[PDB]
Structures are given as structure tokens and as C-alpha cells.
Symmetry: C3
Subunit: 491 residues, 3 copies
């Protein structure tokens, strides 16, 4: 009247943080953690402390050849990836074509060193016209102009002598060389420009064995030209020579480019400001500090990235299902201000709540380890995802799309079920921990106390604060009170 | 002599439905659900309410150029995918080659609008022979003939004047234009047919800059021709002009094709009847109503499909392990005609079975949610899987095969283990639910009853139907009978 | 004073074998099993009982054409894959190019039958010079030489008559035919060698329609040649003829190759000895007997292989957490010399340990089934992983790398978490089994014994070895001792 009591119970709090499990939707819970990165900084950033190459209104081709309307950032000796607009305004001012363009974009996507040099001075053309090679398709300061890196040679007097030019690459570094051929409209234009009616450009390195011949066709005007310029490139290894021979129609190099290539990346289509941030993962919509193993921002990423996932929320339960003084069977304790599982006693020294420190540590550690494993086991490689295929490579683009879409489906399904399965396992761990604590006590006390049915025991003897601590420590000397218990029990 | 009794037990039934778990093979179970679609309708069907294009004995090339033996469905203004036989009977009647054929098949795989028009009337050839261009390789009504969409121009009198033809595309829609070059056997045939010994075809759009030249070689007869016809195509954007100029050997357009292209699909190899069904997933062996997240019919699918899996059966447990009156420890109850877990009482008002409605709902809901999650979380995108690569693209075909085979291995393993893991979890949930119900009762009754060891309690007091309901409701007033219990207990 | 006793306990042993679980790192455990193959034999081996093709210092091209410095294993009628060194010493002695080389390597990667034959005897050149076609780029026995499979025809007297040669393929098997064109330095060399200033090679099968024309350019010396040899191949189906016609610059066939092609494989880069072993999985670093479902040796494998994984250890728990006479609550029993779970009794016939045979079998079977499922459910297809793309196919190489790196990330993550999740499930199974055994006994004995709190019961009656066996059998007749128990209990 009335006997000393110890109850087993668990933490509860004012949290409304919800969670899904394989078996129940929308379960309220004590603490939760999202494993899905949703947040970008909305800017293009260095990658591993190397600037991008931003081409505001130029294309790579425009940029390389010197489209004279390309008002771009000129000096920039190294980059990690390239940013083009979707359809750049300024491409090939004079209509034509860039042979193996997509392969050259991919090669220029990440460069360790890039330095333009002069290989063939515009001044060394003694027996041809350097400065007439000019068009109203390629306007500069209101006047007609041309690509600035490459010389459109015309006949001088009424003569176009055969050209012979070797350049030997005496630099330490691979040289990227560009040249072109002019495809004129008719045999009139051919002779008007080059005198010789039948022409060729021949180019040879140790690798290259090229003989180009102009093609006449009747073609629709583009930038008011029916002519076409067709451009070619090669990489001149650092002790080789390139050898040009031409009768006519030659768009000769002035400027080449020293390159040092140390692994690839890609070209990103984006409308964003550089931001002076560093990052290890860049997106068309912005960069990411990628601690989380999943993101849902954009598929077309460059760097060490979280796996892209079609998903709004990946939330793991970390805490508990959230809902004398009665114990566990009836609900959680707001009063358990600290600890996850534990006790409420009441004796002659008075009542209160105590944490089971030992079984609360085991569980915080377990849940923490569960969360870190799901995060830390994620293998994170460098990748560069772009669209590097032209309108005659659609079969290969469709191969790429099945692969991307394939991996998106695997990660999205697996992450979704991983969260649902481990949430069901986390809430059952908490149940299993509370019930093991009931049984820890039940098995110490045996007949020295009676199970009240609600999570509590009423003692058959006096249990002061020091006896209570021995129950919580698992050091309860049952023989020391079996005598006193037996007397109150029999009655 | 003898006391009132309540037992805890679970449903059992005549089911032989088996299931595998990570730990036990072939476990009999109360109800099961297959998550593996195995059933097709054996027919080719519309896709998203758009007909396929069935080419019974033609190839796409045959079909486009007008191989005159191609007896096909002529009118058909739009399609979602194409069906060819494996090796069609009718291809190129006159032997030769179709430039960039596989890219053109992929472009024509799904078309929003397709309308043949005449761009160059067969009648407009005033200074050349339209109607002699004919061969016994391309037989029609027993007589020698040719491709019907394209004109094989021969010299008139003994003259082949230079051809100049612009067509301007004044339609609203992109035009697909086809032309050809004849590669003859020798300089005799060349002049016999075209007079001029040295010829060219030149074709120019705003895009295209082509000059074809016939090639002589000594070639093996095919359909009794040693000649070769080589065909070319382009897409004429809706305000551009195409410009032909030819000396000879020109296979000119008569008919072109208006196309509107809204995303791609592929070409399916199949021997099946159209069936007037609609579907969202088509297979070479038949269509699928794809509610299930996995199928095992065929890899080469077009649509939103279940993931293809190498597997006979993916069966999830939904029910229970299947095997006074004794309770749970001894087996299941055929008498539990309704509900999964519950009770059998016997008192002075008589005996019977009662469901634990509350804990049976929780579990049906849980299992239902488990099954729906495993199904609903499956991300389902449109994909079109074909073999779009020729016998010089084998490296790219092998890239495609590693990717397909790679995803088949991931899904097949993951689905197999997902079923085994969640089956072990489902059967342990049912164990855990029954035992929690034993403990619900055990904890209400305490010493007012004795555990019989077999799943049952014998009461130490009179428990009529209304007391029993309070045990099942969890509203058992123990103080109301501790007195009467204590008297029968002490004795 | 003192009463008969039965305790429930579990196996323990001197094991230090550790294991990780989703929730605890470094858990000591009774027995463990690695599922990660780490061990290769360090040798190149037959694949499915078919030898590889080892090219010690040759390239495939060198090998095919007969680079006379290629001292290789000559006779070898069939192979399963090819081994080249990274950069072979001996390639094209005379500098040039092999058209569609990578596609030909992939076609020759696995051959069912390969037999060189003579199609055009070196002796049949009556009106040209067979034996002058020779260079100091292609040295043999100190003297100048050439490719041995192919004849460099020079003019005889000062004449190079037009060549006409059909070969008809009267063998049962596809023929691989090789020829070349010489691209000379200038019109002097052209006429010095071939007399005719303007030349062509024309080649025609039922498939092929080729006209090659030599290209002059000024080119850097390679092996002291500025000339270039460019080689071409085709497959002559078994009743077709190939037809050569040449004016000059013709590198004619002597030897062709009978091939029978039955599915593909790839070219492996490795520095290893053949070893006369058979295997079903080959690695650049050595072969594997692939019973395990995961390996971490090398990505570039050929055969039925374990999935490649970035991982040091995949270790599954199979045994138990490893740590009167007290039962389970206090730790494991070294004395439980045999069985996983069971009993220690002590009565008047004396004390000892007994296995619960029934519940130990269930569990060994369960764990064995868990391990076999994780291994046996692994779908294992043939694949051949190589690097089959040249320095202008980098976009397709980058597609391949994302796919490989993609699958490495999926398998590595999934295997890691599968081990951690199933380890946590295995240790909780063992807990759940021991506690069910405590409850098996507790529920048989009821009040005929008292729970000592530590895993033990003290009996309220005499329990000889035969009573004890009935407790372990689950056949304990409680009515047979309730009388004797009640007397000792009341007191
Ligand atoms: C879960 O919660 C949200 C409210 O935040 C609600 O839209 C949804 O309907 C709830 N229930 C289920 C079963 O999804
Ligand atoms: C071109 O150069 C000069 C005149 O400025 C003259 O000597 C030369 O012969 C001219 N050639 C012709 C063919 O008109
Ligand atoms: C085609 O016709 C239209 C309208 O008559 C004209 O504006 C257009 O420029 C023509 N296209 C070409 C390139 O001639
Ligand atoms: C547990 O509690 C008792 C009572 O306060 C105390 O004497 C003892 O130090 C504790 N035992 C252990 C092992 O912590
Ligand atoms: C499972 O059941 C089938 C009979 O339907 C049988 O073939 C098989 O051998 C059984 N047992 C095992 C271990 O697979
Ligand atoms: C071809 O056309 C007519 C005869 O039908 C004649 O006027 C013309 O000159 C003929 N040409 C030749 C070169 O025979
Ligand atoms: C090759 O020889 C066979 C048998 O003599 C002959 O039937 C076949 O047509 C020949 N092939 C060609 C295309 O000449
Ligand atoms: C449970 O059972 C008792 C006895 O029939 C009944 O009076 C009461 O309405 C029920 N209580 C609840 C909360 O359903
Ligand atoms: C696990 O064990 C190894 C010693 O073999 C040690 O390096 C490591 O630090 C241990 N602990 C953890 C938390 O990884
Ligand atoms: C080459 O062959 C013989 C001399 O050996 C001679 O009959 C023939 O005319 C020679 N030709 C020329 C053009 O010198
Ligand atoms: C380029 O110049 C270097 C050094 O003067 C020389 O050794 C080298 O051979 C030259 N290259 C060629 C192919 O001429
Ligand atoms: C179990 O043990 C008892 C006592 O030894 C023995 O009589 C009986 O044969 C056993 N019962 C069964 C079903 O094995």
C-alpha cells in the first residue's frame, strides 16, 4: 500500500518527421535523415581547382578558327570542361563543315596546356594574296573579313604558283593544326580566284596522307554564300613535320595550338554564370558538395557525383516510432528527456526517469553505422556525361540513352527499396531493444516482484534508489531480498 | 474441473502454393503472389494507339525506292515502330548499296506523318529517255522493270546533255529525297548508255555538297547484273532547295517523301500477325499488359516494359507458413475460417474461434504494402531495343550486348534475392505477430490464469463470453477477478 | 539443497574470424565465409578447351601480311582469344595503314578454322617483276625484303601492262583476302616503279566495288620511307570470285586465309606465359576457377566470370557471435563441443552438455542455403572485355568506360550492403533461435521449475537423465510431476 515500482519505456518527442517502410506508409518518427542531395548552388564552378572554358556565343569551331564575330575570353591556358550554349549564334560565318568535329570537341574537352602560336606568318606569302581572302559572310568592324587563324590565299597578278610549306614542330608539345579547302560555285569562280582550273591540297605528316580536291555543286545561299569552306585538323607530334602542297583553293594555317592532353571530360550545355566556387561535381543547373550518395538535380554531370535518381525523398528512420506512470505497452515518455530506452522508478526516496545508457549507446551507434554504411560504401568514380553524337550517329546516341536510362532505373528502384527495407528493420530493432530490456529486468527480479501487465513491476520488498541502480546495472542480488519478498508474497 | 480456457493460434488452409526464402527452399504457404509476367498475346499491336509498319516480304530500302516486286500495304501515314522479316525476300532487285542505310532505318523507325509526293515528273525529261531505264533483275508483270520511285535516265538519239534540276521544298514539312548512281561494268556500257565517257552527279542543299563519280570494276553477277546501283538520301528542310547536275549515270528522283519526326523507336524482327489490340509494351513473340515489374518473354522489346529477367518464377509469400483445442505451438487452425491470427475460447456459454481483427488488419495491410512497393517503386521509361548495327559495326554491337547482358544479370540477381529476403522477412513477421498476441494475453491475465505450455491459458475464475471479449479487446479488468482467482489458486 | 538444473546455451570457440554488419563493425564470430575470389594462377590458359593466339612481338596486321621480322608460332588452326603486347615492336615494317583494322581484329578475335592458302602464285607474274618489290624498311636476313603474304609488283623492261586476275573461291569456307596500294612520294618515283603516270586498282566481289587511286603528298620518313602502303581486306563468300584490275601501285595477294567464324571474343593486352591450364575465365593478370560470384583481380576479362567489384573482402557470417554453470544470458559455452544451440543439465546421475540436434540442423541448413543462394542465383553469361577503339573513336571508348564504371559501381555497392544486411540478419537469427529454445523449455516446465534468471531452470522435483531427455525432445509430462513439484514448491 502501495509497493515500490520500476517501469521500462522509450523516448517520445514533438517531432512530426515522417518515414515510409516496406510495410507501412507515413510513420511518425523521433529523428530522420535524408540521403538525397536536392540542392545546387546554381553556378558553373572550377572542377578540382581548374576553371571551365565558357563560350558565351561561340561554338568550339568558331572559337578555334577565329570566327571574327567571336567576342570571347581570349587568354585561358588550361580547362577541365567546356560550356557551350545549346545552339551558339556564331559558328562558321562562311558556310561549310569541320571534318571529325565531335572527336575534336571531345579531345579539347579537358586540356592541361593550350597556347596559340604562329607557324606560317601571313607575311611569308610573297607570290600569293594573303589579304584579299575575305567575305561579307564573315563581317568584322562593318567591313568584310574572314576566320582570323587561317589565311584564304588568292592569286597574285593572274598567277597561283604551286605552294610548298613544311612546318617542323620544334616545340616540346603536340601541335593541333587546322587548314581548309574552298569548294567554289563554278569553273568561272574557280579561275577568277585561283587561275588554275584543276586544283588539289596535299597534306602529309608521318601519320597523315591527304589529297583534297574541290567539289563544284549548285548550292543554296547561306550567309549569302553558295561557296563552302571545309576544315581539317591533325595533331603534329613534337618532332614531326607537316607538308602542304596546293595548286589553289587552299585555306592555309597562320596559327596552330600547342596542347598537352591528360585525360578527357566533355562539353556541357548551360546558360549559367561562372561563380569562382570550387566543386567536385558540376551540373547544367549548378554545382554540388556531394556528401550524399544520391541526387535528383540533373543527369548530365561532370565529376565525382552522387548517383542520379528519379525520386523526391530518400528519408531513413534514425529514431523511434513516435507517439503510477505506465511503461512501454501504452506508449512513449516525453519525460525520457535524454536516452532512447530506459526506466521510471518510484520508491520512498521518490520517483523519476533514468536512461539505460548501455543499450541506448549500442543503438545510437548501430543506427549511426547503418546511415554511414549506406553512404560510405558508395563507390564514386570521375565521369563526364554529355551529348557528343551528331544527327548521323543517332543509333549510338540511342545506345547511350538506354545505358543512362538503364542505370537511372537500377539506382532509383534500389535506393527506394533500400530505404523502405532498412526503415522496417530500424523500427523493429527499437521494438526488439525495448522488449529485451523488459526481459533483462523480469529475469533479474523473478518472484521478488510482480509484472503489472503494462510494462511495470511492483516489488514485494523495499527497493530504495541503491537497489534500483542495481536493477539498471544488472547487478540485482535476488538472494538478499528473497526472504523479505516471500513474507509479503505469502499474504 | 475443468476451467475456462483461451488459446492463441493462426489461420491454416488446404493450399499447396510453395515459396523459397533465403534460408529454406520449398516452404508451403497460405497465399502467394507471382511478380513475374510470363504471358504475351502472341500478336503485333498498336503502341500507345499508333499502328506499326509491317513489311511482310520487303526491306525498308526495297519499300522506299519502289522495288516493283514489293507487294506491301501502300497507304499508312504514321507508325510507332517497323516490323521486317529476318532476311526479306525482296531488297535491291538491281544489286548495289544504300549509303547510311542503318541511320535511315533508325530515322524512319517512328514517323508522325509520311506522304509520298512527286518532285520531278517522269514526263519532264524532254532531252533524255525516262522509260528505257529498265532491267530483268527488277521484273514486274513478267516484263523487265525498275525501282518505281526513281528514274534510270538513258541517252536520247546519241546524246546525254548535262542535267540541271532544282527542287525547292515549298511544303511545310521536311522532305526525304533519294537518288542513285549507276556503276557500269566497262567504258563500252558507259558510252552505250550515257554517251559521255567521263561523268559525275553533283547534289547540293544548304547542307549537302556531293560529287559522285561512277566506278568501274569487274564484278560477279547478282540477279544476273554485274552493274551496281548505289543510292543516297538527304532531308531537305522546308524552305531549302536541292540542285542536281549530271553528265550521266544519274538515277534521278521522281517521288520524295514528306516526313514529320517526333522521337525515335526501332525495327523489330518478327513473323507475327497484326491483331488490332493496343499495348504499351511489344515483344517479337507478342504484346504485354505490363502491371508486373519483371518479365521473362524476350529481350528485344519496344515501349514502357517490365525489366527482362532470366527466371522462371518470382513468387512472394503473402500468407502464413501452412500446416481442449491446442494453440500456436502445435500448428495452425483450419477452423480459423476468417482472420490470420486470433483466439479459441471455451467457457460455460461454449467454445469457438475469434479473429484478432486489429492485428490481422495491420498485417494484411503490411503484406499488401510490401507487394505494392516492390511493384509501384519500379521506374518505367520508354525504350526501343533492336539490332541496328551492320557487319562492320560488330565492335559497337558487342558494346550493346555487354550492356544488355549486364542489365539482365543485375535485374535477375536482384529480383531473385529480393524475393528470397522478403519471403524470409514475411514468414518471421507472421511468427513475431502470433507471439506478440500470446504476450498481449499473458500480460493482461498474469496470475488470474495459468499458461498450459501449448499456446493456451486456463483461467482461475469464471470467464463468460463478455470477460473473453475484454481479453481480445485488451480491456481485461484484472482487479475485478484477482479475489475469486486467488481463492481457486490457493488450493 | 541443491535441486536438479537444466540451462540453455550456445557454441563458442577460439575463432578470431571478424565480420561487419549494417550496424556493428568488426564483430568476432564462430565461422565465416569469403564470397570474393582474390586468387589468379598468373598465366594465360585455354578457354573452354581452346588455345589462345599469343603474338609475342607482332601486331595482328604484322602477323596477317607477313611482316618478315615477325618470328611467331606459325601453325595454329583455331583460337578463342588473341593476346598482343601493349605496343608491339613489329607492326607495318613499311609505313602505311590498314583500312578497318579494329573491325578485322574483332572478327579474328575467335576463329573455329584458319588455314593460309595460295590464291595467286608469285610465279604467275609473267609480264611484271614479283621479286624487286623490296625495301630496307622490311629487313629479313640482313638483306632488304617485304611483307611475305603479299607481292609488290614492279614494271618489267619499262612496261607495266594492265593486270586482270579473277580468283574464284572453290573452298568450302569464307576466304579473307588482303591487298594494298603504294602511295609514292612524287611522279618520278611513280614512273620509275610503274611506268604509267596515272594508275588505279579496282577490286570487285558480289559485295565489293572498289577503285583505289594513289595519293602523292610530301611525307616525313618512317623506317626511312616517305612512301606509304595502304592495305584493304574483304571476306570472299565460298562460291564468289574477286576480280583485280591495276595499272600500277598494286600490292597483290599471294596468300589468303580460309576462316570459319562461330561467335566473337576480343584481344587481350598481357605479358604472361601460356600455362597449358584450362579455365572458363581469363584475366590479363591470370585465369580464375570462378565458383565465387564476385572477384577484384582485373576488369578486362574473357569468359564466364564473377562480377568485378572494387572491394578487399566480402565476408558472410555463418556461425554465431563469439565470446552451477550459467546459460545464454552470460555468454557462450566452449564445452558445447558439437552443436550450435543446446543444454547443460545437472542431476543425481551427474552433469553435462547436450546439443539441440533439431534446432541446430534447421540453422546450419538455413545458413548453408543463405550462402548458396547468394552464390547460385548469380546469372553468369560469356563476355569479352577489351579496348577495341582507335584514337578517333574516343567518344565511343568514353561510352564504354561509363558503362563498365557504371556496372562496377552497382555491383560494388550492392555486394557490400548485401553482406552487411545479411550479416545483421544471420546474427539476429542465432539470437532468435537461442531465445526460442529458452521459451521451448520455460513453456514445458511451467511451475514444476523456477527460472534462475541466467538462462537456467532449477526443478522442484527429481529429474533424472530420462526426464531431461523428455525436456530436450519436447515430450515433458508435466502432470507426472506436478504433485511432487507442488509439495517442494509450497515450503
Ligand atoms: C502521406 O502524407 C501526405 C501529406 O503530407 C499525403 O499527401 C498522403 O496522401 C499521405 N498518405 C499516403 C498513403 O500516401
Ligand atoms: C604578272 O606580273 C608582272 C606585271 O605586273 C609581269 O611581269 C608578269 O608577266 C605578269 N604575268 C602575266 C601573264 O600577265
Ligand atoms: C525556295 O522558295 C522560297 C519561296 O519562293 C524562297 O524564299 C527560298 O529562298 C527558296 N530557297 C532557295 C534556297 O532558293
Ligand atoms: C551497479 O549498481 C550498484 C548499486 O549502486 C553499484 O554498487 C555497483 O558499483 C554497480 N555495479 C557495476 C558492475 O557497475
Ligand atoms: C522443390 O520442389 C520440386 C517439385 O515441384 C522439386 O523438383 C525439387 O526437387 C524440390 N526441392 C528442392 C530442394 O529444390
Ligand atoms: C539526233 O537527233 C536528230 C535526228 O533524229 C538530229 O537532228 C541530230 O543531229 C542527231 N544527232 C547526231 C549527232 O546524230
Ligand atoms: C565460281 O566457280 C563456280 C563453279 O565452277 C561457278 O558456279 C561460280 O558461278 C563461280 N563464281 C562466279 C561469280 O563466277
Ligand atoms: C471491449 O470489450 C468489452 C466487453 O465486451 C466492451 O464493454 C468494450 O466496449 C470493449 N472496449 C473497447 C475499448 O472496445
Ligand atoms: C577493425 O579492425 C582492424 C584491425 O584488423 C583495424 O584497422 C580497424 O581500425 C578496426 N576498427 C574499425 C572501426 O574499422
Ligand atoms: C622491252 O622488251 C624487249 C627487250 O628486252 C623489247 O622487245 C621491247 O620492245 C622492250 N620495249 C621498249 C619500249 O623498250
Ligand atoms: C624536325 O626537326 C628536327 C631537328 O632539327 C629533325 O631531327 C627532325 O627529323 C625534323 N623532322 C622531320 C621529319 O624532318
Ligand atoms: C523423447 O524422450 C523420451 C525419454 O527418453 C523417449 O521415451 C521418447 O522416445 C522421445 N520421444 C520422441 C517423440 O522422440
Amino acid at each position: 500500500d502501495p509497493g515500490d515500482q520500476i517501469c521500462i519505456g522509450y523516448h517520445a518527442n514533438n517531432s512530426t518527421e515522417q518515414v515510409d517502410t516496406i510495410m507501412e506508409k507515413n510513420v511518425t518518427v523521433t529523428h530522420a535523415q535524408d540521403i538525397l542531395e536536392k540542392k545546387h548552388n546554381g553556378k558553373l564552378c572550377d572542377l578540382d581547382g581548374v576553371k571551365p572554358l565558357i563560350l558565351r556565343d561561340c561554338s568550339v569551331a568558331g572559337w578555334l578558327l577565329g570566327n571574327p564575330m567571336c567576342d570571347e575570353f581570349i587568354n585561358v591556358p588550361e580547362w577541365s570542361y567546356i560550356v557551350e550554349k545549346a545552339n551558339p549564334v556564331n559558328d562558321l560565318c562562311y558556310p561549310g563543315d569541320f571534318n571529325d568535329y565531335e572527336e575534336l570537341k571531345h579531345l579539347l574537352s579537358r586540356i592541361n596546356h593550350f597556347e596559340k602560336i604562329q607557324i606560317i606568318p601571313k607575311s611569308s606569302w610573297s607570290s600569293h594574296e594573303a589579304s584579299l581572302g575575305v567575305s561579307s559572310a564573315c563581317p568584322y568592324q562593318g567591313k568584310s573579313s574572314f576566320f582570323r587563324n587561317v589565311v584564304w590565299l588568292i592569286k597574285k597578278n593572274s598567277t597561283y604558283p604551286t605552294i610548298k610549306r613544311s612546318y617542323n614542330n620544334t616545340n616540346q608539345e603536340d601541335l593541333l593544326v587546322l587548314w581548309g579547302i574552298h569548294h567554289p560555285n563554278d569553273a568561272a569562280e574557280q579561275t577568277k580566284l585561283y587561275q588554275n582550273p584543276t586544283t588539289y591540297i596535299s597534306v602529309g605528316t608521318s601519320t597523315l596522307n591527304q589529297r583534297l580536291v574541290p567539289r563544284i555543286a549548285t548550292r543554296s545561299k547561306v550567309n549569302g554564300q553558295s561557296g563552302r569552306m571545309e576544315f581539317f585538323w591533325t595533331i603534329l607530334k613534337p618532332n614531326d613535320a607537316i607538308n602542304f602542297e596546293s595548286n589553289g583553293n587552299f585555306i592555309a594555317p597562320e596559327y596552330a595550338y600547342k596542347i598537352v592532353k591528360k585525360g578527357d571530360s566533355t562539353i556541357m550545355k548551360s546558360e549559367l554564370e561562372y561563380g569562382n566556387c570550387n566543386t567536385k561535381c558540376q551540373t547544367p543547373m549548378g554545382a554540388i558538395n556531394s556528401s550524399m550518395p544520391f541526387h535528383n538535380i540533373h543527369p548530365l554531370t561532370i565529376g565525382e557525383c552522387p548517383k542520379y535518381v528519379k525520386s523526391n525523398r530518400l528519408v531513413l528512420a534514425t529514431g523511434l516510432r513516435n507517439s503510477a506512470i505506465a511503461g512501454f505497452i501504452e506508449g512513449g515518455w516525453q519525460g525520457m528527456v535524454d536516452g532512447w530506452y530506459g526506466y521510471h522508478h518510484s520508491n520512498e526516496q521518490g520517483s523519476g526517469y533514468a536512461a539505460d545508457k548501455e543499450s541506448t549507446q549500442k543503438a545510437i551507434d548501430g543506427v549511426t553505422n547503418k546511415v554511414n554504411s549506406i553512404i560510405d560504401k558508395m563507390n564514386t568514380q570521375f565521369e563526364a556525361v554529355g551529348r557528343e553524337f551528331n544527327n548521323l550517329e543517332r543509333r549510338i546516341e540511342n545506345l547511350n540513352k538506354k545505358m543512362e536510362d538503364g542505370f537511372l532505373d537500377v539506382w532509383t528502384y534500389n535506393a527506394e527499396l533500400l530505404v523502405l527495407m532498412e526503415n522496417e528493420r530500424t523500427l523493429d530493432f527499437h521494438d526488439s531493444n525495448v522488449k529485451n530490456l523488459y526481459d533483462k529486468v523480469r529475469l533479474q527480479l523473478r518472484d521478488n516482484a510482480k509484472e503489472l501487465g503494462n510494462g511495470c513491476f511492483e516489488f514485494y520488498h523495499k527497493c530504495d534508489n541503491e537497489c534500483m541502480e542495481s536493477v539498471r546495472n544488472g547487478t540485482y542480488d535476488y538472494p538478499q531480498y528473497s526472504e523479505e519478498a516471500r513474507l509479503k508474497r505469502e499474504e
